[PDB]
């Protein structure tokens, strides 16, 4: 049930760009 992690990940969205820089 990935829908459980993706739903909560909404709060950690800011992290989707914080680390994304390490490779971007």
Key terms:
46% helix
Specify the number of helices. Answer: 2
The residue fraction in helices comes out at 40-55%
Structural class: mainly alpha
Order of helices and strands: HH
How large is the radius of gyration? Answer: 10 Å
> How far apart, in Å, are the first and last alpha carbons?
29 Å
Oligomer: monomer
Please summarize the sheet with the most strands. Answer: none
Shape: elongated
Beta content? under 5%
Number of DSSP strands? 0
Helix-strand blueprint:
Blueprint lengths: L2 H7 L5 H4 L6
Structure overview:
This protein is mainly alpha-helical and 24 residues long. Helix content is 46%, strand content 0%. It contains two helices and no strands. It has helices spanning 3-9, 15-18. The longest helix is centred in the first third of the chain and has 7 residues, at 3-9. The protein is elongated and about 30 Å long.
